[PDB]
């Protein structure tokens, strides 16, 4: 029953007595459910150390992974280019999932097409699918470029993308001069960040491999910036703003911020902004190429050093204080422009915020997960703040990345209790936060479930989730935030300290019980 004045959605409609009675009767009479005592005992067992040992002995089963497949990152990278349609050779369910994922994260339209390879296409190959799909996409959505990635089925059967696109061009399905960069993106290799790297390398080599004779390094006096897999629009914006204030000429290749942040003014823009084709053509003329997230831009690094002949600098992701300083100083040493006073003042204001908040930040223990470069930057910044990143999980990390992060932890007194896990999923991490409880965990929306689980052990065991990373589905407009540069460090610091303070306020809100510490001034 409902009252027309106050209408209850599912919560709290299904807390009504009739609905509770119905659910109890359903479970009692037809579900054959385990007894509540058995369920409680099994949950308590799952929160134990022996269960964690069993969990970490897993070899074949993955539970709640913290990664996606390559073509998602390929689609994002392709989206970062002007009037470019992402085109995934393979089955259409993949494209539907990629679009839904990015739609839920960004709350914006995400354009991507499939060539709809069915069983007959699996058996006979996707040549006809490629020809018809390229023709249909170009005629329907009028892109100036079609960037081709693959689903797992086309990678298993060896659908040769190069041959398929070439045959499409020579047979008149698409114009011969129409740019169709391609990249093999096997979903059973690496992760979504690997797909981003592969797609970017494909686009770069499409626009630069053959026409290298007339290229001389530095002739355009710009700096190439490769962002990598990035889902914070403020990160693109902050890199652009810091380079603009610095008087540095730059070329941000794969810039998707405009297409993912279009206005609602009565019309739908399928394409907006993005790296122009001329930018990629002229990229070899740059003074140098700086990789924003080098640890999933290895293939791009090999191509840039071996083909464009750019001495790509060894820079960590510009996250936190020290690494933003290093990034700015390297940009200075490359372009010859000095670091301006506005950037110095922004750095000083970040330092002032750190001094203002160190008492609440110091000693705080964290479990964090995400992509390797983001995770490493977060670890470095947390060490800068005096926090303890006790659990550091990277599902798609590798041994060398683990070595680098271990060396970073060894250089700080606040990395003594820190452990780096690679190839582990969020079930491992839920065990980790049960058996060695941190104060907070930082990660994407999936971590919410871990928080729920911790709250079931009790309020004193609950590990609150701080939502930084990808994807964030249960909050609105957090994709607009920043994590790079001094501005990103300021936003992260504000989020961390205010999460701590809100947690403390909640834990001291009980009148005559804990409100003696419910201080107005913190």
């Amino acid at each position: 029953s409902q009252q027309v004045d106050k209408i209850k959605a599912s919560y709290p409609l299904f807390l009504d007595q009739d609905y509770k009675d119905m659910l109890a009767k359903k479970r009692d009479g037809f579900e054959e459910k385990y007894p509540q005592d058995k369920i409680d005992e099994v949950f308590q067992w799952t929160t134990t150390k022996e269960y964690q040992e069993l969990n970490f002995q897993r070899e074949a089963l993955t539970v709640n992974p913290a990664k996606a497949c390559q073509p998602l990152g390929a689609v994002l990278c392709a989206l970062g280019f002007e009037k470019t349609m992402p085109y995934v050779h393979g089955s259409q369910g993949c494209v539907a999932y990629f679009r839904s994922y990015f739609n839920r994260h960004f709350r914006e339209p995400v354009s991507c097409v499939s060539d709809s390879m069915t069983e007959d296409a699996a058996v006979f190959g996707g040549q006809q699918n490629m020809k018809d799909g390229l023709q249909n996409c170009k005629a329907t959505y009028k892109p100036d470029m079609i960037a081709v990635s693959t689903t797992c089925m086309a990678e298993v059967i060896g659908d040769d993308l190069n041959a398929f696109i070439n045959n499409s061009k020579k047979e008149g399905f698409i114009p011969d001069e129409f740019p169709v960069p391609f990249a093999h993106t096997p979903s059973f290799v690496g992760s979504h960040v690997t797909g981003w790297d592969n797609m970017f390398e494909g686009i770069a080599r499409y626009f630069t491999l053959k026409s290298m004779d007339d290229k001389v390094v530095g002739s355009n006096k710009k700096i190439n910036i490769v962002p990598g897999f990035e889902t914070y629009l403020g990160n693109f914006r902050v890199i652009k703003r810091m380079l603009s204030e610095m008087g540095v000429g730059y070329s941000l290749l794969s810039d998707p911020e405009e297409v993912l942040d279009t206005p609602a003014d009565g019309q739908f823009r399928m394409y907006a902004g993005g790296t122009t084709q001329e930018e990629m053509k002229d990229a070899p003329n740059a003074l140098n190429t700086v990789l924003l997230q080098p640890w999933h831009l290895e293939k791009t690094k090999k191509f840039v050093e071996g083909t464009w002949k750019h001495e790509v600098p060894k820079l960590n992701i510009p996250m936190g204080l020290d690494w933003t300083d290093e990034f700015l100083m390297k940009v200075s040493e490359i372009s010859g422009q000095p670091i301006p006073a506005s950037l110095t003042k922004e750095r000083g204001r970040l330092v002032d915020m750190m001094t203002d908040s160190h008492t609440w930040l110091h000693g705080k223990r964290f479990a964090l997960w995400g992509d390797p470069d983001f995770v490493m930057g977060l670890v470095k910044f947390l060490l800068e703040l005096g926090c303890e990143p006790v659990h550091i999980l990277c599902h798609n990390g590798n041994k060398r990345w683990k070595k680098a992060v271990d060396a970073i932890l060894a250089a700080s007194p606040y990395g003594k209790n820190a452990t780096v896990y690679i190839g582990k999923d969020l079930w491992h991490l839920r065990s980790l936060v049960f058996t060695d409880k941190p104060d907070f965990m930082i990660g994407n929306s999936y971590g919410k479930f871990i928080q729920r689980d911790t709250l079931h052990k009790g309020k004193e065991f609950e590990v609150p989730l701080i939502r930084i990373g990808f994807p964030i589905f249960d909050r609105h407009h957090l994709h607009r935030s920043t994590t790079l540069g001094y501005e990103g460090a300021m936003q992260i610091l504000t989020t961390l300290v205010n999460s701590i303070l809100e947690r403390l306020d909640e834990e001291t809100r009980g009148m005559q019980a804990t409100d003696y510490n419910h201080d107005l001034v913190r």
Binding site: I339, T344, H362, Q512, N517
Partner: protein
């Protein structure tokens, strides 16, 4: 460093003042020398602040409402006058209490008469009576009403005593008029004195003709402990762990019942001499209750004070004190063994109100830290007399220091850590010097007793050794 250089530093700092201000401020700065018997020749204090010099001092309202009266849980304290004073003083001081706020406790609430222009022109006595009636109607579980005067009340001659008497008789309530208008005195010290006099005249004598309280020989009352961050509690658990019965706490987590029961106790343990020595002397000379100054800052001072207090009782109390000392010895020893190596040899400068600039020196020295500069906002001659026996040789002493003076002293001395209030914290944080709030404990604490010592050492190490202080200079600058 060296008695001569710090004197030269004092003269150089004073050089910028006009001759009148320089002549005044020269008498408020000194170099400590334990070869001095009376601080009158050394340093003078409790004088008028020089105008326009950006002093740190508060007002008599701050010393009365904000310090003494405010912490009392079950009483409603009304900031009589315009809206500013009570609003700025609302829950700025962390005098911790247990109660149900708005029902039977009111400490963090701001009760005010909110004077408008017509209240100034035509008087506020009728408004005060109506306010008392409204307080009764809406807060029937309050156990007392105090009326803290602000500046206009003192100026226009509002007869708050008459209102208090009439309304208290009519409602069988204790209504205490406090003439703590901010312009009286020179600082919070006269606020302390006025608040103590109000307690003596309106509260302390209510149970004089009452003998229904059972009194044990081990009855002590904590005076001048305002439960900052739970300080008093951390102190109290020690005393009652050595057999004593803590009848009263003044005034942090304090109830009007405890103040009324204070004359029934046998000993008065005064923590803050400056704020509540008036009432301690009054009770000594009226009820014959001895009072002793103690100190629960750091293990050395805590043990020394516990043994001194035990020596005033039977052998059972002394045995209980010894067992308390032996029980808590490993914990503070572990705290020292953990945090002293991180803090040994670090120099600290202090500037707090009237007791803590000298009381916390022992706690710092328990961690191998040397106090090279100290000073008071509003201390008297006797406070500096007590300070001389605690400060080291050739250490800077300042009274009512100005912002300019204290900034220059910090620049020259270059201490590792500064302990002062909220109005100096960000100034010295921007100079790259670790800062600890020594009033609010930087929203941490307690710092009293052994648990307080553990927290104090943790905070000192956390701020002193924070990595942020190594990042003040941009790497692209010399």
């Amino acid at each position: 460093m060296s008695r001569e250089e710090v004197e030269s530093l004092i003269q150089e700092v004073l050089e910028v003042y006009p001759e009148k201000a320089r002549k005044d401020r020269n008498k408020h700065l000194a170099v400590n020398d334990p070869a001095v018997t009376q601080s009158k020749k050394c340093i003078i204090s409790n004088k008028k602040s020089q105008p326009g010099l950006m002093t740190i001092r508060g007002c008599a309202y701050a010393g009365s409402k904000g310090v003494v009266w405010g912490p009392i849980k079950d009483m409603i304290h009304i900031s009589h006058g315009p809206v500013g004073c009570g609003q700025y003083s609302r829950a700025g001081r962390r005098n911790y209490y247990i109660g149900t706020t708005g029902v039977n406790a009111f400490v963090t609430m701001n009760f005010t008469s909110d004077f408008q222009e017509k209240d100034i022109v035509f008087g506020g006595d009728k408004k005060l009576a109506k306010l008392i009636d409204e307080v009764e109607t809406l807060f029937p579980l309050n156990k007392g009403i105090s009326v803290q005067s602000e500046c206009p009340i003192g100026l226009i001659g509002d007869d708050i005593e008459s209102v208090s008497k009439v309304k208290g008789a009519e409602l069988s309530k204790t209504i205490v008029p406090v003439r703590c208008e901010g312009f009286r005195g020179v600082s919070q010290s006269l606020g302390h004195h006025i608040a103590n006099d109000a307690v003596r005249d309106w509260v302390l004598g209510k149970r004089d003709e009452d003998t229904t309280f059972a009194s044990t020989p081990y009855d002590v009352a904590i005076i001048g402990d305002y439960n900052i961050g739970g300080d008093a509690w951390s102190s109290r658990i020690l005393l009652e762990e050595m057999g004593l019965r803590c009848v009263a706490q003044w005034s942090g987590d304090g109830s009007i019942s405890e103040i009324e029961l204070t004359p029934k106790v046998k000993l008065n343990l005064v923590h803050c001499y400056r704020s509540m020595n008036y009432i301690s002397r009054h009770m000594e000379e009226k009820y014959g209750i001895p009072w002793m100054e103690y100190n629960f800052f750091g293990p050395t001072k805590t043990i020394e004070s516990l043994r001194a207090i035990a020596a005033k009782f039977d052998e059972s109390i002394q045995k209980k004190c010894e067992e308390v000392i032996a029980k808590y010895k490993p914990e503070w020893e572990a705290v020292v063994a953990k945090y002293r190596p991180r803090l040994e040899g670090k120099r600290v400068m202090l500037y707090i109100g009237g007791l803590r600039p000298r009381h916390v020196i022992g706690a710092y020295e328990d961690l191998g830290m040397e106090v090279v500069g100290t000073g008071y906002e509003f201390a008297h001659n006797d406070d500096y007399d007590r300070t001389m026996k605690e400060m080291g040789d050739s250490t800077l002493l300042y009274d009512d220091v100005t912002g300019y003076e204290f900034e220059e002293f910090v620049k020259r001395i270059k201490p590792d850590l500064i302990g002062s209030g909220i109005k100096e914290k960000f100034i010295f944080q921007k100079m790259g010097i670790p800062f600890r709030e020594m009033h609010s404990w930087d929203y941490s604490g307690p710092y009293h007793g052994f648990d307080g010592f553990a927290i104090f050492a943790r905070d000192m190490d956390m701020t002193l050794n924070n990595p942020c202080w190594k990042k003040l200079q941009a790497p692209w600058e010399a």
